[PDB]
Amino acid sequence: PQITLWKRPLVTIKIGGQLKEALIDTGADDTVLEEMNLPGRWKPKIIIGGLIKVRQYDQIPIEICGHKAIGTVLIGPTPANIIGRNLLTQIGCTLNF
């Protein structure tokens, strides 16, 4: 689709079978969602206040406005759901003007 920036670009993402509202954030390298139940092994990662510990899951299937992609998702006490570039490149998201 084509999203304008008059308001925060919040979209729906399907991950782990659940639907959620995340913010398309071109200024974020990574994707970090609030606590949820994901299947698989994960590894520790330390990354909105100070440092927080999160769980890094790799090659997780996700869906943003249709568009099926896979990639790394950090799950943790993030103040907000953020879709970063690591996933934005996977759905072919670009900035245009």
Q: Does 89 bind a copy of itself (CB under 8 A)?
A: yes
Binding residue (CB under 8 A) for a copy of itself from 20, 23, 42, 72: 23
The distance of closest approach from Cβ of residue 65 to a copy of itself in the complex, given in angstroms and rounded to an integer, is 8
Both tokens of 31, joined, read: 């994707």
Calpha distance 19→26 (Å, rounded)? 21
Q: Does 65 bind a copy of itself (CB under 8 A)?
A: yes
Run of H or E including 85: helix 85-88
| DSSP secondary structure code for residue 90 in this structure | G
Amino acid at 75: I
The distance of closest approach from Cβ of residue 29 to a copy of itself in the complex, given in angstroms and rounded to an integer, is 7
- Any catalytic annotation for residue 25? yes
